[PDB]
């Protein structure tokens, strides 16, 4: 029995921690909603 609990407002934060790269990937999406890499 799943239940929900509020965790916050949806707002942009000025000076939030900035990280992560920006990869450009060739991908395939199957009928089950799974992504896979095309190589």
């Amino acid at each position: 029995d799943m239940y929900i609990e509020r965790a916050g407002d949806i707002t942009w934060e000025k000076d939030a921690e900035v990280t992560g790269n920006s990869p450009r990937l060739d991908v395939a999406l199957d009928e089950s909603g799974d992504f896979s890499l095309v190589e």
């Binding site: 239940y3 929900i4 509020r6 921690e17 450009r24 060739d26 395939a28 909603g33």
Partner: protein, 156 residues
């Protein structure tokens, strides 16, 4: 139950203690999350019940109480923020420049950030605070790191 707009944790008491299985967005009286978080089951909000209204396994999305309301899109140029809601931890904003998933049916933004599985459904926002998609359906690339699509629904 609570109908205030915002980000919410999706919890279960079926397993040991209270476990966070994912996250979602309340907007315009509709609850939005990824299909793999709830598997399309009904949800509780206090004494109230939220019933599924629309869902799609291939898109990996589901809406409750009404049709999908989120229609903002990544501009393809700017940094966005993941509003990560990890299990047992405070909501936190992480800013990043998305990469791209190139598919036979078009390109989709992707964020290269790695959080626990119970973080799926956390919203990705633009600089105006609009939800441009949900985090948590993606792939494991060559170096072993996780990259999530920016998954957005269609507002009919």
């Amino acid at each position: 139950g609570e109908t205030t707009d915002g980000v919410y944790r999706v919890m279960t008491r079926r397993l040991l203690g209270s476990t966070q299985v994912g996250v979602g967005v309340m907007q315009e009286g509709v609850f939005h999350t990824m299909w793999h978080v709830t598997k399309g089951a009904a949800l509780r909000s206090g004494e109230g019940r939220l019933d599924p209204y629309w869902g799609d396994v291939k898109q990996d999305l589901v809406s409750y109480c009404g049709p999908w309301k989120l229609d903002a899109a990544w501009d393809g140029l700017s940094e966005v923020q993941l509003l990560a809601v990890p299990p047992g931890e405070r909501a936190k904003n992480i800013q990043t420049l998305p990469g791209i998933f190139k598919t036979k049916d078009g390109d989709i933004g992707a964020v290269a950030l790695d959080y626990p599985a119970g973080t799926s459904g956390s919203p990705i926002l633009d600089k105006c605070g609009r939800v441009i998609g949900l985090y948590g359906n993606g792939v494991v690339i060559k170096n072993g790191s996780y990259v999530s699509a920016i998954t957005q629904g269609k507002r009919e």
